[PDB]
Structure formats: structure tokens, C-alpha cells
Design a protein around this ligand. Structure first.
Ligand code: CLA
Ligand code: CLA
Ligand code: CLA
Ligand code: CLA
Ligand code: CLA
Ligand code: CLA
Ligand code: CLA
Ligand code: CLA
Ligand SMILES: CC1=C(C#C/C(C)=C/C=C/C(C)=C/C=C/C=C(C)/C=C/C=C(\C)C#CC2=C(C)C[C@@H](O)CC2(C)C)C(C)(C)C[C@H](O)C1
Ligand SMILES: CC1=C(C#C/C(C)=C/C=C/C(C)=C/C=C/C=C(C)/C=C/C=C(\C)C#CC2=C(C)C[C@@H](O)CC2(C)C)C(C)(C)C[C@H](O)C1
Lengths: 172, 30, 175, 90, 179, 34
């Protein structure tokens, strides 16, 4: 039986060893798609959403030199439009597309099984050299990433109603 | 209008096609 | 096993470590589809052209022949304000040099170390290990000059000035 | 006359039973017959609703109602998959 | 030495077959050529101008036939379709010669592919841009006469184009390049 | 017509010499033992 949803049966493709396992798959989506594909996809959505949430908050707090005269009022997604007329969004697109071409290759060996989901071996600083601290950081990455996906949705949707942007919407 | 030099360009390129057609035909013939 | 430069990727089979310039950097598997001797010959020839071209860009912007049709210091615009009979004469001469150096060979026919065209008239490669060091130097400066020349020609399309002119006066106070 | 190639993962799908084996469903081989049947009705209702909302088509149609209208034929394949899974005991 | 009236291709040999080493002598033979790519683009543009201008009396002769007829109608479609095809081609080619004549080598592709943000001097600041203005006004006259039904108006306006285009060629003296 | 001399050169060659040569050489090829 399932941990998160007691009435529902345990998801067949989901196991405790996998990070952020709460036995949560009511719709049985893990049965449809390859689990490694979903796991890499969750991790990718998590990391982009963490960047997006921190980006929302920091763009509230301060702005980089000169951006105020490129874009004056727009805060959350309005800036995206101003900067596509300029070249900023295109530049970031090009370099993330470069990284995602190598991510295309990386996902191919993940489906071959020789690479773990989300494992890009990018640990320059010494933060994973325990294999106990590594598993805790793995869990915290998944949980903070899930929280960031929901938060990014809440911050942009709040902008969609109000236009205030996150922390300004908090103040007024 | 078309100049005669332009006609001569076409005759050069069609000649190149004639030479390539012979070589393809000889390859098909073995 | 794994790729030295790309840690999450496996190391390509056709690299093997021995061949100069290898940090395991072949993610798109181009060595499985093509012979690596031809690829290195192409890389060396590309880098050699690019080192000549980048040096040409800087030096043309500083100095030019005491003639009209050579005055323009923007490399791209210099290509057009100059006798085209001379330009084709260079193109024909390059065709000659390419033939003799490669000993009149095609892709299979060329393969002889890849890129060792024999045009080293002076005895710089005295020590063979110093030769190996110079080989690593040659590819690293060639790879750097491929990106470097590309930046210079696209700066010249953007700025319209040339390499050193585009650097010295880059418009900090606008896009 | 020479071996005819098929993509890797080609399996045998010829059936003479009441229903085909669940392998004919591809990535949906493990979905239950209840889940297709509920998806089948859901796709039919949402697809019909989205189709109904744009029957007088304009030069500005709502793109979600267009995309949502593709659920109606997709529901046909869903109830066929629901019948196949029910008759395979899934 | 000049441009063929109908083809717009370098016609006369120029009596220059010099192999002459040392001084190139602008030897019309390739690899002895002293002409820039810019000069060759200019001769192509001048050839386009010749084709258009020689075509100008065709409209003039056609319009005269129209006026002579038992009942005269001034085919607005013919006059407009001439203007849309031949006349506009003249103006754009004249503008391009001015662009090369003013900014210089940058218009030859020195600044790159044609872009929405051309980073060069415009077709203005040219001594022969005034002739381009004459043709532009004449195109407006040709269309205005066709809408009005004025046979004489079309003929005079086409004549204005012919004088202006010939004037452009004479002041420019486009280099005749055969390579 | 531009290069108006070309039809009076190429049509007799294409229409008479070209078939006259392919018939002559095809006949030799179809009537040889080796
Ligand atoms: C996409 C991001 C972006 C954009 C559009 C800009 C845009 C601009 N910056 Mg730049 N800048 C950026 C990121 C960006 N900056 C970053 C990440 C840094 C490093 C922290 C800087 C550091 C920087 C400096 C140091 C200066 C500018 C300045 C300027 C403006 C020059 C004209 C002006 O306002 O007067 C220009 C509009 C100039 C300015 O006006 O700043 C006061 C200037 O001198 N920028
Ligand atoms: C086969 C040998 C040969 C011969 C006969 C020539 C002869 C010529 N070349 Mg060529 N050239 C050669 C080899 C040769 N060059 C080689 C090996 C290169 C390097 C690839 C070039 C690159 C070259 C360029 C880039 C140009 C010429 C030009 C010229 C002409 C100017 C003459 C001169 O001496 O200018 C030297 C100048 C003086 C004596 C000053 C007076 C002349 C017809 C120029 C020309 O007019 O274009 C055709 C020109 O722009 N040549
Ligand atoms: C070794 C290679 C090299 C070097 C040193 C440069 C350096 C430069 N280029 Mg060139 N460039 C390169 C390769 C290179 N580029 C290549 C391979 C391309 C693709 C073809 C370009 C295309 C390109 C364009 C289109 C433009 C530049 C511009 C610039 C300048 C902007 C500074 C910068 O990068 O801010 C950004 C740096 C960071 C965000 C740090 C990370 C700088 C002088 C700009 C320029 O000249 O200013 C007007 C410009 O418009 N470059
Ligand atoms: C009447 C047409 C028809 C039918 C019955 C199917 C049926 C199916 N397709 Mg196919 N498909 C179709 C048209 C059709 N497709 C078209 C037009 C395209 C082009 C876009 C595709 C491209 C496509 C892909 C790329 C894949 C499928 C897959 C599947 C299976 C997934 C079932 C599912 O989602 O479970 C829940 C199922 C057997 C998947 C599969 O497993 O194939 C065997 C799969 O990966 N379909
Ligand atoms: C058929 C044999 C032949 C003969 C009899 C001549 C004779 C002559 N040529 Mg030459 N010439 C020849 C072949 C010949 N040429 C070939 C094959 C070419 C290459 C296409 C040239 C290219 C040539 C040029 C470019 C010029 C001459 C010129 C001349 C005449 C005067 C100057 C002189 O001595 O030039 C020196 C002799 C030679 C260069 C070749 C011998 C001279 C009578 C000059 C002249 O008056 O032309 C109008 C001149 O400028 N010649
Ligand atoms: C990896 C290959 C690569 C990449 C990413 C770029 C990237 C770029 N090029 Mg370059 N270019 C390249 C190869 C490349 N180039 C090669 C091989 C050629 C020779 C055919 C050119 C010739 C070229 C010209 C003539 C121009 C650019 C321009 C540009 C810019 C894009 C706008 C445009 O019109 O593109 C066009 C892209 C091509 C023609 C490549 C095919 C951008 C900086 C333009 C620009 O704004 O200058 C910076 C411009 O005017 N490029
Ligand atoms: C399939 C293409 C095709 C066909 C059917 C024709 C038909 C004709 N052409 Mg030709 N022509 C063509 C392509 C073609 N043209 C092309 C591409 C060129 C540019 C090089 C020319 C250049 C050309 C000239 C310069 C002249 C003609 C002329 C003619 C006419 C008389 C025949 C003659 O003299 O041929 C001569 C044609 C050539 C020497 C050109 C080569 C023909 C093409 C390229 C080869 C086609 C091969 C074909 C696919 C396979 C045939 C074999 C068959 C048994 C399977 C006739 C209307 C003459 C004319 O107008 O008389 C009034 C004339 O003077 N044509
Ligand atoms: C396919 C193209 C073709 C062409 C270009 C011609 C051309 C001609 N035909 Mg026609 N003819 C053709 C097909 C063609 N024929 C076919 C298919 C048939 C059969 C239906 C005929 C039947 C036919 C008849 C019955 C007659 C002609 C005549 C003529 C000649 C026109 C009148 C004239 O002034 O002649 C003046 C002719 C000359 C001054 C003699 C010139 C002889 C040439 C130049 C020498 C040829 C040498 C030879 C072909 C080399 C052979 C090489 C080897 C590979 C076979 C002219 C040469 C008439 C004719 O012969 O005129 C006398 C004529 O009576 N034709
Ligand atoms: C050092 C280094 C590493 C690294 C790294 C990096 C850069 C790591 C960065 C990680 C990041 C960016 C984490 C940020 C998470 C944000 C969250 C969870 C959001 C919470 C918001 C909530 C609940 C909300 C809300 C809100 C709503 C919706 C609307 C608002 O009106 C109001 C409000 C604001 C309250 C790595 C691992 C790469 C390797 C190596 O070791 C080197
Ligand atoms: C082998 C050997 C011999 C030899 C030899 C020879 C011919 C040696 C010649 C070697 C050469 C020409 C090396 C030149 C390399 C150029 C480089 C590395 C630059 C890259 C560009 C950069 C960093 C940039 C940039 C720029 C950008 C993009 C935008 C700009 O606005 C500004 C900026 C400047 C910053 C010989 C044959 C004589 C015989 C002998 O027996 C053996």
C-alpha cells in the first residue's frame, strides 16, 4: 500500500531507494513512462525552478547595473519581453541550448543506464564526499526543488493577477 | 534579355552534366 | 572509461589517449562516423588558416601596403575594396599548394602522420619530445585562433572597425 | 529474400484470443482498464466541451480549446485500450 | 566600354588583352584583373539600369498605340504592371549604386548579410541621388496619369525617367568590367 | 533572338550527325562477337 495516499496501492514502478520517495503516484504516471526519464525530468524541472524562484526574489531585492534604464517598470515576466527586443534572453537561450545539447547526450546514456538521473558529476566544492551527507543533500535537492516549482508558479501567477512581483506583493 | 555569354555559361554547365551522365551510365553498365 | 573533460559522458573509443590534444572531448560521437586521421588533418589545417587569418586581421588594421585598395583596415570590408584578380590569384595558388603538400591525394588517399605536410624548412623540431610539445602548442593555438578569428570577423560585422579598434572603443554606455 | 529489419524492441503482436495482449498498448501496457475507462470518458467530455466552445471558428480561437479538442478522437483510442485491459484482467 | 541595351552585359572588349606583368594594366583577363568586387557589382547595377531605360520607350511606344486606337482607354493595368516591374527595378538599382558610391566597400557585403539594421551610410549623400529622386517622382507621375486617363502624362513621365537614368549613367560613368 | 546563329548550327548536328553517329556506333556494338 502507499505511504502518501493510504487508500491507494503503492506505485509499482516507485521504490524507497529513489530520492524523494513518498509513494506518490495516484495516476500511475510512472507506469506509463520510463522511470529514469521522469526522474531526470523532475530533477531538471527542480533545478530550473530553484534558479527561477531565487531569480524572482533577487530581482525584487536588487537589480544589476544598467538594467533599470533598459527596463523600468516590468518585474517578473515583463522583463523577458523587453530583453527579447534586446539580446539578453537570446544569449541565455543559446548557452542553455548548448548545455542542453550535452544534456541530450547525457539523457541518452541515462536511458542506456550508465548514468544516474540528474548526475552530471558537477561537484567542484567538497559537498558530497560522505555518501551519507550525499544522500541527505540528494533528498534536500529534491524537496527544495519541488517547493521551488510550486513557489515559481505562485510568484508568476501572483504577478499575473497583480503585477506587483513577489516581495512587493508581500509588502502591499 | 539573355546575353550570349549567359548562354555559354549554360552550355558549360550542361557539358559538366553530360560528363557526369556518361560516368553514371558507365557505372550502371559496370 | 569516462570522459576527462566531460565527466558524465563516457570516453570515446576512437580517442585512446595517445593522440595529441585529447581530453576526451568528443561528445557528439563524430569519431565513430569519420576517420580521426582525416579529422585531425582538417583540424590542423583549419587552425593553421585561422592563425594566419587572425594575425592578418590585427596586422592589416595596424599596417597596410602603401597603395590604394589596401587602405581599409576592416578585414571584411578590405576583402571587397581590393582587386579581385589578385584574390583569385591567391585562391589558385592555394589550390596549387594544397595539391603538392598533400601529394595529390583524396580523403582515403591522404593517409604519414595527420597534418605532417613536411613544410618545416627550419630545424625547430630538434628534440622529438620538444616536437611533441610544439605539436600540443600548435593545436592549442590553432583551436584558440579558430574561435579568436571568428570573434574578430563577427565583431567586424557588428562594430565595423576591426579587432583592436573594436576592443579599445567598446560602447559601455549602450547595447 | 534477405532478413527484413525491424526496430529494436519489436515483439510479436499477432493474437487470436478475445483481446490482444497488453503489449499492443506500448507505453500504456501497465495502465489499468479502470484508468483508461475514466480517461476515456474524461477525454470525451473535455474534448467535446472544448470542441463545442469553438464550433463557430474565428480568426482568434482560444489555443487551449483547439488543443483540448484533440481529446475527442483520443478518447476513442482510450476506450479501446480500456476494453483490451479489462479483457486481459488489468 | 558600354552596356548592351537589352542584355545589360559588358559589350565592347575595351581593346585590353594586356598580359602586362609589373603594372597590371587592368588586364581584363582573370588573375590580371585590377577591378574590385565593388566595381563588378557597380557594372551589374548599371546593366540593370540600361535594361530598364531601354525598356522605357517600349511603354512610350505602347502608350502611343493606345492613344491612336479607334476608342482610347489607357490600359491602367499595363501602365501599372510596367511600373511595378520595370520602373521599380530601376529605382532600387539606382539606390544601390548610390549606396555603394557613398558608403563604399561596406555596401558590397563588407558589413555582412543584408540586415534590417544596415550598419553603413544610406543611399543619400551621393551626387547622383538627385537622379534617383527624379525617377521616384516620375513613377508617381506614371501611376497618377494612368489613374486619370492622361495618355500624354504617361509618355512625358516615362521620358523624364529616361533622361534621369541616362543622366545617372553619364555622371557615374560606371566601370565596365569583363572578367 | 540572342545568339541567333545557334539553332542553325546545333539543329543539323543534333538532328543529323548525332543520330548518324549513335546509329553507326550502336550498330558496331550490337554486331560484335566480343
Ligand atoms: C542583461 C543584463 C544587463 C543589461 C541589459 C545591462 C544594461 C546596461 N548596463 Mg550593465 N551590467 C550587467 C547586466 C546588464 N547591464 C551585469 C551583470 C553587470 C555586472 C555586475 C553590469 C555592470 C555594468 C557597469 C559597471 C555599467 C553597466 C552599465 C549599463 C548601461 C549603460 C547605459 C546607461 O544606463 O547609462 C546599460 C543600459 C553602465 C551604467 O550606466 O551603470 C551605472 C556601467 O558603467 N553595466
Ligand atoms: C606566377 C608568378 C606570378 C606572376 C607573374 C605575378 C604577377 C602579378 N601579380 Mg601575382 N601572385 C603570385 C605570383 C605571381 N604574380 C603569388 C605567388 C601570389 C601569392 C598567392 C600572388 C598574389 C597576388 C596578389 C594578391 C595580387 C597579385 C598581383 C599581380 C600583378 C601585379 C604585378 C606585381 O609585381 O605587383 C607588385 C607591385 C609592384 C611591382 C609595384 C609597381 C601581376 C600581374 C596584383 C594584381 O594586380 O592583381 C592581379 C594583386 O592584387 N598577385
Ligand atoms: C576567443 C574568442 C572570443 C573573444 C575573446 C571574444 C570577445 C568579444 N566578442 Mg566575439 N565572438 C566569438 C568569440 C570571441 N569573442 C565567437 C566564437 C562568436 C560567435 C561567432 C562571437 C560573436 C560575437 C558577437 C556577435 C559580438 C561579440 C562581441 C564580443 C565582445 C563582448 C565582450 C563579451 O564577451 O561580453 C560577454 C561576456 C560574458 C557574458 C562573460 C561570460 C568581446 C570583445 C560583441 C562586440 O563586439 O561588442 C559590440 C558582439 O556584438 N562576439
Ligand atoms: C489511429 C492512430 C494511432 C493509434 C491507435 C496509436 C496508438 C499508440 N501510439 Mg501512436 N502515433 C500516431 C497514431 C496512432 N498511435 C501518430 C499519428 C503519431 C505521430 C505523432 C504517433 C506517434 C507515436 C509515438 C512517438 C509513440 C506512440 C505510441 C503509441 C501507443 C501509446 C498508448 C498510450 O499513450 O498509452 C497510455 C499506442 C499503441 C507510443 C508507443 O509505445 O508506440 C508503440 C510512442 O512512443 N505513437
Ligand atoms: C603569334 C605570335 C606572336 C607574335 C608575332 C607577337 C608579336 C608581338 N606582340 Mg605578342 N603575344 C603573343 C604572341 C605573339 N606576339 C601571345 C601568345 C600573347 C598572349 C595572348 C601575346 C600578348 C601580347 C601583348 C599583351 C602585347 C603583345 C604585343 C606584341 C607586338 C609588339 C610588342 C612586342 O614585341 O611584344 C613582346 C612580345 C610578346 C609579349 C610575345 C612574343 C609584337 C609585334 C603588344 C602589342 O602591341 O599589342 C597591341 C602587347 O602589348 N603581345
Ligand atoms: C557555428 C557557426 C556560426 C555561428 C553560430 C555564427 C553566428 C553568427 N553569424 Mg556567422 N558565419 C559563419 C558561421 C557562424 N556564424 C560562417 C561559416 C560564415 C561564412 C559563410 C558566416 C558568415 C556570416 C556573415 C556574413 C554574417 C554572420 C552573422 C552572424 C550572426 C547571426 C545573424 C546572421 O545573419 O547569421 C548569418 C549566419 C550565417 C551566414 C552562417 C551560415 C551570429 C553572430 C551576421 C552578423 O550579424 O554578424 C555578426 C552577418 O552579417 N555570419
Ligand atoms: C531535356 C531538355 C531539353 C530539350 C528537350 C530541349 C529541346 C530543344 N532544344 Mg535545348 N537546351 C536545354 C534543354 C533541352 N532542350 C538546356 C538545358 C540548354 C542549355 C544548355 C539548351 C540549349 C539549347 C540551345 C543552345 C539550342 C537548343 C535547341 C533546342 C531545340 C532543337 C534541338 C537541339 O538543337 O538541341 C540542342 C540542345 C543542346 C545542345 C543542349 C543539351 C540538351 C539537354 C541539356 C540534354 C538533355 C538530355 C536528355 C535528358 C536525355 C536525352 C536522351 C534520351 C534519348 C533519353 C529543341 C526545342 C536549339 C534551338 O532552339 O533550335 C530552335 C538551340 O540552338 N537548346
Ligand atoms: C532531324 C533534322 C533534319 C534536318 C536538319 C534536315 C535538313 C535538311 N533536309 Mg531533311 N529529313 C529529315 C531530317 C532532317 N533534315 C528526316 C528525318 C527525313 C526523313 C523523313 C528527311 C527527309 C528529307 C528529304 C526527302 C529532303 C530533305 C532535305 C533537307 C535539306 C533542306 C533543303 C536544302 O536546302 O538542302 C540543301 C542541301 C544541301 C546543299 C546538301 C547538304 C548536305 C550536307 C551538308 C552534308 C551532309 C554530310 C553527312 C550527313 C555526313 C554523315 C556523317 C555520318 C555520321 C552519317 C536540309 C539539309 C532535302 C534535301 O536533301 O535537299 C537537297 C530533301 O530532298 N529532308
Ligand atoms: C555551490 C555549488 C552548487 C550550487 C548551487 C546553487 C546556485 C544552488 C541554489 C539553489 C536554490 C536557488 C535554491 C532556492 C530554492 C527556492 C525555494 C525552495 C523557494 C521557496 C519559496 C516559497 C515557499 C514561496 C513563496 C512566495 C509566493 C509563492 C508568492 C510571493 O508573493 C510571496 C512568497 C515569496 C512568500 C552545486 C550543487 C551546483 C555544486 C557544487 O556544490 C558548487
Ligand atoms: C611551423 C614552423 C614555421 C612557422 C610558422 C608560423 C607561420 C607561425 C605563425 C603563427 C601565428 C600566426 C599564430 C597566431 C595565432 C593567433 C591567435 C592565437 C589569436 C587568437 C585570437 C584572440 C585571442 C582574440 C581576439 C579578439 C576578439 C575575438 C575581438 C577583437 O575586437 C579584439 C580581440 C583581440 C580580443 C615555419 C613554417 C616558418 C618553418 C619552420 O621550419 C616550422
Amino acid at each position: 500500500m502507499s505511504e502518501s495516499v493510504p487508500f491507494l496501492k503503492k506505485p509499482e514502478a516507485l521504490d524507497s531507494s529513489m530520492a524523494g520517495y513518498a509513494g506518490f503516484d495516484p495516476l500511475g504516471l510512472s507506469s506509463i513512462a520510463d522511470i529514469k526519464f521522469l526522474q531526470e525530468s523532475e530533477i531538471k524541472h527542480c533545478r530550473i525552478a530553484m534558479l527561477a524562484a531565487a531569480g524572482s526574489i533577487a530581482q525584487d531585492i536588487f537589480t544589476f547595473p544598467g538594467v533599470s534604464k533598459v527596463v523600468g517598470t516590468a518585474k517578473m515576466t515583463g522583463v523577458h519581453d523587453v530583453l527579447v527586443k534586446q539580446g539578453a534572453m537570446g544569449q541565455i537561450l543559446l548557452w542553455t541550448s548548448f548545455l542542453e545539447v550535452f544534456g541530450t547526450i547525457a539523457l541518452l546514456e541515462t536511458l542506456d543506464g550508465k548514468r544516474a538521473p540528474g548526475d552530471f558529476k558537477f561537484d567542484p566544492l567538497g559537498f558530497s564526499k560522505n555518501a551519507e551527507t550525499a544522500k541527505r543533500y540528494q533528498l534536500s535537492e529534491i524537496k527544495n526543488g519541488r517547493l521551488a516549482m510550486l513557489a515559481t508558479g505562485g510568484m508568476v501567477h501572483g504577478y499575473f493577477i497583480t503585477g506587483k512581483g513577489p516581495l512587493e506583493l508581500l509588502t502591499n | 534579355m539573355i546575353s550570349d555569354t549567359q548562354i555559354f555559361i549554360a552550355l558549360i554547365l550542361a557539358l559538366v552534366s553530360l560528363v557526369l551522365a556518361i560516368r553514371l551510365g558507365r557505372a550502371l553498365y559496370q | 572509461d569516462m570522459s576527462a573533460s566531460v565527466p558524465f559522458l563516457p570516453r570515446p573509443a576512437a580517442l585512446d589517449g595517445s593522440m595529441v590534444g585529447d581530453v576526451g572531448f568528443d561528445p557528439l560521437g563524430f569519431t565513430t562516423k569519420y576517420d580521426i586521421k582525416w579529422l585531425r588533418e582538417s583540424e590542423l589545417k583549419h587552425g593553421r588558416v585561422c592563425m594566419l587569418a587572425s594575425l592578418g586581421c590585427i596586422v592589416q588594421e595596424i599596417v597596410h601596403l602603401p597603395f590604394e585598395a589596401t587602405s581599409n583596415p576592416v578585414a571584411s570590408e578590405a576583402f571587397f575594396q581590393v582587386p579581385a584578380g589578385g584574390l583569385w590569384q591567391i585562391f589558385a595558388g592555394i589550390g596549387i599548394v594544397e595539391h603538392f603538400s598533400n601529394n595529390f591525394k583524396m580523403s582515403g588517399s591522404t593517409m604519414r602522420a595527420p597534418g605532417n605536410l613536411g613544410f618545416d624548412p627550419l630545424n625547430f623540431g630538434k628534440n622529438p619530445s620538444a616536437r611533441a610539445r610544439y605539436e600540443l602548442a600548435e593545436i592549442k593555438n590553432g583551436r584558440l585562433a579558430m574561435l579568436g578569428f571568428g570573434g574578430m570577423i563577427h565583431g567586424c560585422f557588428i562594430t565595423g572597425k576591426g579587432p583592436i579598434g573594436a576592443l579599445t572603443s567598446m560602447d559601455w554606455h549602450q547595447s | 529474400f534477405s532478413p527484413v529489419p525491424s526496430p529494436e524492441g519489436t515483439k510479436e503482436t499477432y493474437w487470436e484470443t478475445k483481446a490482444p495482449s497488453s503489449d499492443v498498448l506500448g507505453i500504456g501496457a501497465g495502465v489499468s482498464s479502470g484508468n483508461f475507462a475514466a480517461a476515456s470518458v474524461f477525454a470525451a467530455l473535455v474534448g467535446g466541451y472544448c470542441t463545442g466552445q469553438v464550433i463557430p471558428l474565428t480568426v482568434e480561437p482560444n489555443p487551449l480549446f483547439l488543443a483540448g479538442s484533440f481529446l475527442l478522437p483520443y478518447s476513442w483510442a482510450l476506450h479501446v485500450a480500456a476494453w483490451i485491459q479489462k479483457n486481459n484482467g488489468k | 566600354a558600354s552596356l548592351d541595351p537589352k542584355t545589360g552585359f559588358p559589350i565592347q572588349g575595351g581593346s585590353r588583352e594586356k598580359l602586362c606583368g609589373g603594372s597590371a594594366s587592368a588586364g581584363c583577363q582573370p588573375m590580371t584583373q585590377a577591378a574590385s568586387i565593388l566595381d563588378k557589382q557597380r557594372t551589374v547595377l548599371a546593366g540593370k539600369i540600361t535594361v530598364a531605360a531601354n525598356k522605357v520607350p517600349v511603354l512610350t511606344a505602347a502608350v502611343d498605340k493606345m492613344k491612336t486606337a479607334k476608342k482610347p482607354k489607357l490600359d491602367r493595368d499595363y501602365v501599372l504592371r510596367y511600373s511595378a516591374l520595370y520602373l521599380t527595378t530601376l529605382v532600387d538599382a539606382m539606390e544601390q549604386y548610390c549606396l555603394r558610391d557613398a558608403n563604399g566597400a561596406k555596401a558590397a557585403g563588407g558589413a555582412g548579410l543584408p540586415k534590417f539594421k544596415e550598419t553603413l551610410k544610406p543611399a543619400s549623400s551621393s551626387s547622383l541621388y538627385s537622379y534617383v529622386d527624379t525617377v521616384k517622382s516620375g513613377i508617381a507621375a506614371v501611376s497618377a496619369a494612368a489613374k486619370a486617363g492622361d495618355f500624354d502624362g504617361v509618355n512625358k513621365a516615362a521620358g523624364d525617367i529616361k533622361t534621369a537614368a541616362d543622366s545617372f549613367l553619364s555622371t557615374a560613368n560606371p566601370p565596365i568590367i569583363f572578367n | 533572338m540572342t545568339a541567333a546563329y545557334l539553332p542553325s548550327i546545333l539543329v543539323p548536328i543534333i538532328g543529323l550527325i548525332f543520330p548518324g553517329l549513335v546509329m553507326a556506333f550502336a550498330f558496331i556494338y550490337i554486331e560484335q562477337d566480343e
